[PDB]
């Protein structure tokens, strides 16, 4: 399985853009302007239509990747075990070949 | 493909170069409150587990029960085996008996 | 020794975030909020993440009759026995600690977690989530057998031990509060108690962000003030519902409990089928109690597999 | 949704008398998509409801 | 009146043929029509993952 | 004479035996154990035999 790691959204109340891109897998560098977020304290900051929303996310493995994973394999020439029992006059024994 | 099987095709459990093609896509948050909207198809691993069905144990063309420890298949008949044996002269009596 | 590892829970005061359906209402801000859900155990276990940690007495401890929910910018109090989670059917709790919940729980089309607060309110909210377990074995059931066989499955055993993976801690942002704008005689005053409220205005000179002072700006109006309070006292979980300042985030580690382990797992044994063989053709009468699986194959070179779930009496040939 | 309607309360002393009624409550969803929980993040299509005063 | 918004369907276009993969979270509806004179309408409810050509 | 026939209940001390699922645990001992269920009426009547009378 995959875990969608998304950090807390970035609100910056100046309106100046801020774009960056690191090397961890599948960043989606998206920046939004003119957002006016709300909060239980009514609202925060003063300026409207001039705000920066920086929201980023990526994917990673899961915590149970050690156990719940599945594996793939390729076929090839195959060797066969054979457990044989041999007996004759006053002798009776098993082996493995 | 994003969702069929092995959407993550990461290599051994050493966790290096975790390739992923799960097709993230962000969206602009609404003006109501803070949002982190994104579109994410469900994991193909879960779908493959849910569908599964008719394991190879019930598909062996010779009723060959399969185990998994050294990925082995046991107790199935096909063909025939040759044998060449050498018997010492001391393992049997002479014609005088 | 037993309670020594709860020191990591010096971090208190979790968030009161946004959740979709208020139950009674349409939207509400609630101390309890549903977050990501883990479901990988093979015996129908669930893992629910809730902001409000349980088993807290303003310090590290473990118990069974104390919950401290948070409403506003202060702590509160309630009782754990009143906490209820229930889908379409009753979602029964086996035992929980910290921020996370586990439960035996019947299939359904939605999830709900509720708990009684300090007085005369049953505030809570729901969440959309599907729970369609795939029982181990070829027999589908809901109750442990009186007679049966053992086939192992994975489950979250009950313990409080360190683990590998982790959740994220960070400084809380600066929540606002408009009740600190008491105007009495055409003058804007800042009250006390909350202290160190950040300040910023276009009203005039004196925009410095007063810290723990009863500063008063004169001849001003409420509409030009947007003060917000901060504490920098205790760090807090990083969710997708609160803002964050750009920094290394100072990732704090609190181990996720209830890891995944193997266990023995009983499974029922179906009744012996009725058999009446004839001539090169075989006839079987079935008496299923629940939807089970029947399959057969030919030992010859051509398998010709057959599989078809059975949930009723039927003749088969 | 359900196939019967029941309402009850506890009276002045130790009794919860009630009675039911046949009612096939099958609310047709508004919009092209069925659900039981309002979106986390969604879009508005106008519909109608009762008023609360 | 809020209403959900399903995920974008997975389109993989062929030649003179359109193949789409659908990953529903709830029973929804998919319809299509042709701009030509004969519309040839279509509607069919969806509850599980499916491919349509 | 109204309560006289209860005298046959001088037999006492209901047992405590094994039952399937105790809720909190997989195996568990409870004073309530479900004996074989009587069901022979025609109005959904169910009769349950429990150790603790
Ligand atoms: C050989 O010894 C085994 C010992 O268990 C016995 O079961 C088997 O019958 C013996 N072989 C013969 C041909 O009697
Ligand atoms: C709020 O603070 C910012 C940064 O210090 C400043 O640029 C802005 O002018 C302040 N707001 C007002 C209304 O002065
Ligand atoms: C569960 O069993 C499997 C197979 O024996 C093993 O690989 C795995 O490490 C076990 N996990 C635990 C937690 O015991």
């Amino acid at each position: 399985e995959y875990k969608t790691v998304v950090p807390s959204p970035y609100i910056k109340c100046c309106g100046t853009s801020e774009c960056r891109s690191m090397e961890r897998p599948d960043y989606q560098c998206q920046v939004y302007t003119g957002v006016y977020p709300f909060m239980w304290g009514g609202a925060y900051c003063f300026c409207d239509t001039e705000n920066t929303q920086l929201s980023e996310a990526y994917v990673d493995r899961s915590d149970v990747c050690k156990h719940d994973h599945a594996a793939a394999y390729k076929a090839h020439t195959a060797a066969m075990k054979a457990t044989i029992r041999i007996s004759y006059g006053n002798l009776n024994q098993t082996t493995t070949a | 493909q994003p969702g069929r099987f092995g959407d993550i095709q990461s290599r051994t459990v050493e966790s290096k170069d975790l390739y992923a093609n799960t097709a993230l896509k962000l969206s602009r948050p609404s003006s109501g409150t803070v949002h982190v909207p994104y579109t994410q198809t469900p994991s193909g691993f879960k779908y493959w587990i849910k569908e599964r069905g008719t394991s190879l144990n019930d598909k062996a063309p010779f009723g060959c029960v399969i185990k998994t420890n050294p990925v082995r298949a046991e107790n199935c008949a096909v063909g025939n085996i040759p044998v060449s044996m050498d018997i010492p002269d001391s393992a049997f009596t002479r014609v005088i008996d | 020794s037993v309670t020594k590892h709860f020191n990591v829970y010096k971090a208190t005061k979790p968030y009161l975030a946004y959740c979709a359906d208020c139950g009674d209402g349409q939207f509400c801000y609630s101390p309890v909020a549903i977050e990501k859900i883990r479901d990988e155990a093979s015996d129908g276990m669930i893992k629910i993440q809730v902001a409000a940690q349980i088993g807290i007495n303003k310090g590290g401890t473990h118990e069974h009759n104390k919950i401290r929910y948070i409403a506003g910018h202060d702590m509160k109090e309630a009782n754990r026995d009143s906490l209820q989670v229930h889908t379409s059917g009753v979602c029964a709790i086996r035992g929980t600690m910290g921020h996370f919940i586990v439960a035996y729980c019947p299939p359904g089309g939605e999830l709900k977690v509720q708990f009684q607060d300090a007085e005369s309110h049953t505030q809570a909210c729901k969440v959309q989530y599907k729970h369609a377990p795939a029982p181990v074995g070829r027999e589908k059931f809901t109750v442990r057998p009186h007679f049966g066989i053992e086939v192992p499955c994975t489950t979250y055993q009950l313990t409080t031990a360190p683990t590998e993976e982790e959740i994220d801690m960070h400084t809380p942002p600066d929540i606002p509060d408009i009740t600190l704008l008491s105007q009495r005689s055409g003058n804007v005053k800042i009250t006390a108690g909350g202290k160190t409220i950040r300040y910023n205005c276009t009203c005039g000179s004196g925009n410095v962000g007063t810290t723990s002072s009863d500063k008063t700006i004169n001849s001003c109006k409420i509409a030009q003030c947007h003060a917000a309070v901060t504490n920098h006292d205790k760090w807090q979980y990083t969710s997708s519902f609160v803002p964050r300042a750009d920094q290394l985030s100072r990732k704090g580690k609190v181990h996720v409990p209830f890891p995944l382990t193997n266990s023995t797992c009983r499974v029922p044994l179906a009744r012996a089928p009725g058999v009446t063989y004839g001539k090169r053709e075989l006839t079987v009468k079935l008496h299923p109690d629940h939807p089970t699986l029947l399959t057969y194959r030919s030992l010859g070179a051509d398998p010709r597999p057959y599989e078809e779930w059975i949930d009723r009496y039927v003749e088969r040939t």
Side-chain angles (χ1 to χ4, degrees), chain A, chain B, chain C:
Chain A
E1 306 180 0
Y2 63 91
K3 184 83 151 293
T4 66
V5 176
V6 59
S8 175
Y10 193 10
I11 301 299
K12 189 252 291 177
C13 303
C14 175
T16 301
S17 62
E18 268 295 89
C19 290
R20 64 201 61 269
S21 62
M22 283 73 74
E23 311 325 300
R24 67 165 46 70
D26 54 37
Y27 273 143
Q28 293 82 17
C29 301
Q30 187 58 255
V31 54
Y32 290 121
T33 72
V35 65
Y36 181 34
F38 272 60
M39 172 46 227
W40 181 65
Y44 62 108
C45 178
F46 65 109
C47 185
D48 290 12
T49 70
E50 294 294 328
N51 274 340
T52 54
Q53 182 54 330
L54 183 63
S55 49
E56 288 307 302
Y58 63 98
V59 305
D60 210 357
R61 64 181 60 261
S62 296
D63 62 358
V64 298
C65 67
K66 193 166 309 218
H67 300 263
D68 213 356
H69 71 289
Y73 298 109
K74 294 259 264 195
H76 271 307
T77 314
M80 65 179 288
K81 282 318 211 182
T83 309
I84 301 299
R85 174 139 69 99
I86 192 66
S87 83
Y88 64 92
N90 264 17
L91 201 43
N92 170 10
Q93 187 156 359
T94 66
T95 176
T96 287
Chain B
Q1 283 313 71
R4 282 293 79 210
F5 167 64
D7 193 359
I8 303 173
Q9 65 183 357
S10 296
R11 286 193 175 279
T12 180
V13 299
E14 281 325 316
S15 303
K16 308 302 300 171
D17 189 15
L18 282 72
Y19 173 93
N21 191 30
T22 180
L24 271 294
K25 157 69 165 283
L26 277 296
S27 172
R28 161 177 264 278
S30 81
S31 66
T33 176
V34 308
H35 321 290
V36 192
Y38 60 88
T39 64
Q40 174 55 260
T41 62
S43 66
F45 188 40
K46 294 312 291 283
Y47 268 93
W48 176 90
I49 297 169
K50 299 289 94 176
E51 71 86 30
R52 264 201 299 176
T54 78
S55 82
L56 188 153
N57 177 35
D58 308 349
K59 279 168 175 279
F62 277 129
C64 183
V65 179
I66 62 170
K67 293 297 181 330
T68 187
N69 189 359
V71 192
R72 65 205 192 280
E74 297 213 302
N75 296 294
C76 47
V78 64
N80 48 4
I81 62 170
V83 68
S84 171
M85 72 288 290
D86 173 63
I87 314 296
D89 270 304
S90 66
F92 38 85
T93 45
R94 220 166 321 280
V95 65
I96 320 294
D97 292 30
Chain C
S1 51
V2 193
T3 62
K4 85 193 168 312
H5 67 265
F6 292 165
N7 62 37
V8 298
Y9 281 151
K10 293 291 103 176
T12 70
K13 190 263 183 181
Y15 43 100
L16 191 152
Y18 193 112
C19 79
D21 291 331
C22 188
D24 185 5
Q26 297 219 346
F27 63 91
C28 294
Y29 273 141
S30 170
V32 69
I34 298 85
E35 192 36 50
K36 76 192 172 32
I37 306 303
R38 283 193 189 85
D39 46 354
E40 71 285 10
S42 43
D43 62 358
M45 291 333 304
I46 62 170
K47 192 162 263 200
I48 313 300
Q49 173 174 20
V50 165
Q53 66 272 10
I54 71 149
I56 181 67
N57 301 338
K58 297 304 192 68
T61 178
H62 77 118
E63 50 81 29
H64 297 76
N65 63 7
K66 193 87 161 295
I67 181 62
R68 305 182 91 102
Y69 74 92
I70 297 89
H73 187 193
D74 61 357
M75 304 281 324
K76 275 292 301 203
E77 178 62 28
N79 263 357
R80 174 207 200 276
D81 57 320
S82 77
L83 160 66
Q84 313 283 40
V85 54
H86 59 122
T87 180
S88 58
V90 55
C91 202
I93 291 174
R94 203 152 170 111
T96 60
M97 71 76 78
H99 294 89
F100 311 147
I101 311 295
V102 298
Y104 280 170
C105 184
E110 65 169 14
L111 190 150
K112 184 181 157 216
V113 174
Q114 63 164 70
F115 75 116
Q116 183 66 41
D117 63 357
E119 69 275 16
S120 75
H121 271 89
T122 82
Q123 48 87 21
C125 65
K126 274 202 291 273
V127 65
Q128 181 62 255
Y129 163 75
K130 276 285 285 294
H131 181 289
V136 186
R138 276 93 174 288
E139 299 183 24
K140 292 216 283 312
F141 64 96
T142 70
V143 172
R144 271 195 59 233
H146 195 233
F147 324 120
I149 322 293
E150 291 46 50
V151 171
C153 47
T154 76
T155 179
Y156 320 114
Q157 51 70 32
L158 282 72
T159 197
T160 62
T163 185
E164 299 87 297
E165 279 208 1
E166 194 35 55
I167 62 170
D168 208 316
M169 295 298 103
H170 183 38
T171 65
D174 61 7
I175 62 170
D177 166 5
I178 54 154
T179 62
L180 301 196
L181 275 297
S182 84
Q183 185 177 183
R184 303 178 182 102
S185 66
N187 189 359
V188 172
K189 274 80 64 177
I190 288 301
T191 79
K195 76 185 176 294
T196 183
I197 297 89
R198 304 311 71 201
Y199 182 76
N200 209 19
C201 277
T202 176
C203 188
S205 298
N207 290 318
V208 76
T210 74
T211 77
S212 185
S213 68
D214 302 271
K215 190 263 184 181
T216 295
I217 191 66
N218 292 334
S219 77
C220 203
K221 304 178 176 189
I222 313 299
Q224 314 184 350
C225 186
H226 43 257
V229 63
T230 175
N231 64 7
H232 320 268
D233 189 358
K234 282 167 299 192
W235 40 68
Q236 184 178 2
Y237 172 69
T238 82
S239 79
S240 74
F241 294 150
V242 298
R244 161 255 179 180
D246 214 19
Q247 190 272 331
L248 205 59
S249 312
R250 188 269 299 164
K251 274 82 76 172
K253 319 306 188 161
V254 165
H255 309 305
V256 62
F258 314 137
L260 177 60
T261 61
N262 298 310
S263 159
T264 175
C265 295
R266 288 189 58 177
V267 65
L269 185 139
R271 302 177 260 253
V275 65
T276 184
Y277 63 90
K279 189 266 183 181
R280 184 151 290 81
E281 199 147 355
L282 183 39
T283 59
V284 60
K285 299 180 294 208
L286 279 298
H287 281 101
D289 63 358
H290 295 285
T292 57
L293 183 63
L294 187 150
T295 184
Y296 61 91
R297 65 214 183 107
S298 179
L299 273 295
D302 313 328
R304 297 215 276 255
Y306 178 92
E307 61 295 339
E308 190 276 331
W309 293 76
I310 283 299
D311 60 356
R312 294 181 310 75
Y313 188 110
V314 62
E315 201 58 278
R316 285 295 185 179
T317 300

